Design an enzyme around this catalytic site. Structure first.
Site, PDB file in Angstrom:
ATOM      1  N   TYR A   1       0.849  -1.194   0.000  1.00  0.00           N
ATOM      2  CA  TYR A   1       0.000   0.000   0.000  1.00  0.00           C
ATOM      3  C   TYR A   1       0.896   1.260   0.000  1.00  0.00           C
ATOM      4  O   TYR A   1       1.678   1.469   0.942  1.00  0.00           O
ATOM      5  CB  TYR A   1      -0.990   0.003   1.178  1.00  0.00           C
ATOM      6  CG  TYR A   1      -2.146   0.982   0.995  1.00  0.00           C
ATOM      7  CD1 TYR A   1      -3.249   0.654   0.206  1.00  0.00           C
ATOM      8  CD2 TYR A   1      -2.124   2.243   1.592  1.00  0.00           C
ATOM      9  CE1 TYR A   1      -4.305   1.550   0.019  1.00  0.00           C
ATOM     10  CE2 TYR A   1      -3.179   3.156   1.409  1.00  0.00           C
ATOM     11  CZ  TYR A   1      -4.268   2.800   0.633  1.00  0.00           C
ATOM     12  OH  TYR A   1      -5.304   3.697   0.449  1.00  0.00           O
TER      13      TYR A   1
ATOM     14  N   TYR B   1      -4.223  -1.901  -9.156  1.00  0.00           N
ATOM     15  CA  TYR B   1      -5.396  -1.958  -8.282  1.00  0.00           C
ATOM     16  C   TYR B   1      -6.302  -3.159  -8.543  1.00  0.00           C
ATOM     17  O   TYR B   1      -7.466  -3.023  -8.932  1.00  0.00           O
ATOM     18  CB  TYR B   1      -6.139  -0.625  -8.336  1.00  0.00           C
ATOM     19  CG  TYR B   1      -5.331   0.481  -7.687  1.00  0.00           C
ATOM     20  CD1 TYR B   1      -4.360   1.179  -8.408  1.00  0.00           C
ATOM     21  CD2 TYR B   1      -5.522   0.810  -6.347  1.00  0.00           C
ATOM     22  CE1 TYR B   1      -3.606   2.192  -7.805  1.00  0.00           C
ATOM     23  CE2 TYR B   1      -4.783   1.816  -5.737  1.00  0.00           C
ATOM     24  CZ  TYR B   1      -3.824   2.501  -6.466  1.00  0.00           C
ATOM     25  OH  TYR B   1      -3.084   3.485  -5.855  1.00  0.00           O
ATOM     26  N   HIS B   2      -5.721  -4.338  -8.323  1.00  0.00           N
ATOM     27  CA  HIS B   2      -6.441  -5.599  -8.232  1.00  0.00           C
ATOM     28  C   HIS B   2      -5.750  -6.386  -7.127  1.00  0.00           C
ATOM     29  O   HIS B   2      -4.651  -6.868  -7.321  1.00  0.00           O
ATOM     30  CB  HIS B   2      -6.364  -6.373  -9.557  1.00  0.00           C
ATOM     31  CG  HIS B   2      -7.071  -7.697  -9.527  1.00  0.00           C
ATOM     32  ND1 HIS B   2      -8.260  -7.921 -10.188  1.00  0.00           N
ATOM     33  CD2 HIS B   2      -6.755  -8.866  -8.916  1.00  0.00           C
ATOM     34  CE1 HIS B   2      -8.646  -9.168  -9.987  1.00  0.00           C
ATOM     35  NE2 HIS B   2      -7.755  -9.762  -9.212  1.00  0.00           N
TER      36      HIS B   2
ATOM     37  N   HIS C   1      -3.627  -8.233  -4.587  1.00  0.00           N
ATOM     38  CA  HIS C   1      -2.598  -9.236  -4.818  1.00  0.00           C
ATOM     39  C   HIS C   1      -1.635  -9.243  -3.648  1.00  0.00           C
ATOM     40  O   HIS C   1      -1.361  -8.202  -3.053  1.00  0.00           O
ATOM     41  CB  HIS C   1      -1.846  -8.949  -6.118  1.00  0.00           C
ATOM     42  CG  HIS C   1      -1.237  -7.581  -6.179  1.00  0.00           C
ATOM     43  ND1 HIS C   1       0.095  -7.357  -5.929  1.00  0.00           N
ATOM     44  CD2 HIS C   1      -1.771  -6.371  -6.465  1.00  0.00           C
ATOM     45  CE1 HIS C   1       0.358  -6.067  -6.051  1.00  0.00           C
ATOM     46  NE2 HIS C   1      -0.756  -5.448  -6.385  1.00  0.00           N
TER      47      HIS C   1
END
Ligand SMILES: Nc1nc(N)c2c(OCC3CCN(Cc4ccccc4F)CC3)cccc2n1
Lengths: 286, 289
Positions: free
Chosen positions: A221, A226-227, A229
């Site tokens: 982060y 933006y999927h 994982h």
């Protein structure tokens, strides 16, 4: 190569510490980015070389110390080469040298500022859906749980050349769509997160003979894409985004959500942002 | 042309970094040699001309607009900087050696039952810390002080930071209060101490070295190198050893952990790495099987 006649435009980034270079070149004259990275050593082949006739060239000698230039045989000279073509302007800014700033994003900040910024962006993750939909890298899969809700694909990350275990690096990509980052996680995802951790570790044990206490298993982060994982890396590898300002351990993420369902909804997260990132300004003013 | 010994037989990989492309090898010869190998930085002009002219690539895989290869470049790109120490004293072997680590997830119960009794079975002197705090030694090295005995601390630079550049900025805050061994002892009683370290530590680095707080990674180690509470202030651009998620804990989040959860560091499981030959690892593994 998928093109011909690379013409340099700009060294986007250069690191003598990481022995890695990022180049923007013109081709088919179209933009392309070529990344070149010297690879990790293979200890047994280097040892075998040192006990033979290695091509050496003394730089200096000071009694017990001596520094040489070594030119190994072809097999030991592998350079990790990554091509992104056609490259967009996103890619040319992305891989550019910029100075990072630290920022502390509260739970309100996220939904009111960060999320609306992300939702205003049109991001490409076709490579991710290619893996999930078995359109690319089908036979590289090390493990898959095919359940659409709680299932995932464990696969070597692009960074890893796979030639040695010292820099072992796999990603687990979930089958479920619309989970963008750590921020979207609730107790709804506990069974998925648990599947990744425990099934991911067993697959790596069975495939590579690497025990779980040898693995640093985390999410990024901010993520680079933006999927949701999770990264599976050797503990001895100083792996990408493994610092405390970016890495969040999966074991801890699962337990955080078990103690407090609204943890990643409520709590302030701290992360690095590039100086030229519009998000950085928007967070600093709120 | 040749190395000054024969029969280089690998004893041990003393150190390796996949990120830095460096290996430190301990080999017996004929009698202890250390061979240090480091791959070299790229020369841009050589890469640029290689890439326009008949490169020897071999595809690893492709997906969409991405593709990775194995490149075997011509001689000028293949230089490996090779340092030989021969013979190698035990001092050399010991300064290049880092043992391989193992992860452990210590529960609050594991700390009480297993880790703390092991700690109390040892006698480790922290007298050097008290000598700084009492101003008997290194008084000239202190950059900032809050002299309060409960909520105060001392700010001193790392011993490897020469203060010649801001790139590897590294200072350390040591609290005046005694008896706080580690993260495991922190309660909301220590919040005034911890906010002072974070906020006054940052203010003093700004004023002295002209570096802003958003340029600073401020964190504790667990397990710590010594059991008297101390905090690391490093430049964000300096990915110093110990800043990995598996050892480091940001002070800002430690403050906030205790603000919404008083008994967090007594109740929660903390993850850290132990050296394979560390007898505390053994104990904890046996107590978890
Ligand atoms: N198995 C596998 N794994 C991957 N990571 C793949 C892939 O990743 C694309 C890139 C996207 C950008 N990064 C990190 C990054 C590095 C330097 C600068 C900025 C960054 F965001 C991560 C890798 C792209 C295409 C296929 C991939 N296949």
């Amino acid at each position: 190569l998928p093109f011909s006649g690379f013409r340099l435009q700009k060294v986007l980034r250069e690191s003598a510490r990481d022995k890695i270079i990022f180049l923007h070149g013109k081709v088919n004259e179209e933009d392309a980015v070529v990344i070149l990275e010297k690879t990790p050593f293979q200890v047994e082949q280097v040892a075998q070389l040192l006990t033979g006739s290695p091509e050496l060239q003394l730089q200096f000698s000071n009694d017990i110390y001596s520094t040489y230039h070594l030119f190994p045989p072809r097999q030991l000279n592998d350079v990790k080469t990554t091509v992104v073509y056609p490259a967009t302007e996103k890619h040319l800014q992305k891989y550019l040298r910029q100075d990072l700033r630290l920022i502390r994003e509260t739970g309100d900040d996220y939904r009111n500022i960060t999320l609306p910024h992300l939702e205003s962006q049109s991001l490409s993750i076709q490579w991710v859906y290619n893996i999930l939909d078995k359109k690319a890298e089908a036979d590289r899969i090390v493990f898959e749980n095919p359940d659409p809700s709680d299932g995932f694909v464990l696969i070597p990350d692009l960074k890893w050349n796979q030639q040695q275990l010292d820099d072992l690096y796999l990603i687990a990509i979930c089958h479920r769509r619309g989970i963008r980052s750590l921020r979207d996680l609730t107790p709804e995802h506990l069974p998925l997160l648990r599947n990744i951790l425990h099934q991911g570790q067993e697959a790596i044990l069975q495939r590579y003979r690497m025990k779980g206490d040898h693995l640093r298993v985390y999410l990024h982060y901010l993520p680079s894409y933006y999927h949701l994982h999770v990264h599976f890396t050797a503990l001895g590898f100083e792996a990408p985004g493994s610092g405390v300002e970016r890495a969040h351990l999966l074991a801890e993420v699962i337990e955080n959500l078990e103690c407090d369902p609204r943890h990643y909804q409520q709590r302030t997260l701290t992360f690095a942002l590039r100086a030229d990132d519009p998000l950085l300004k928007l967070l600093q003013e709120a």
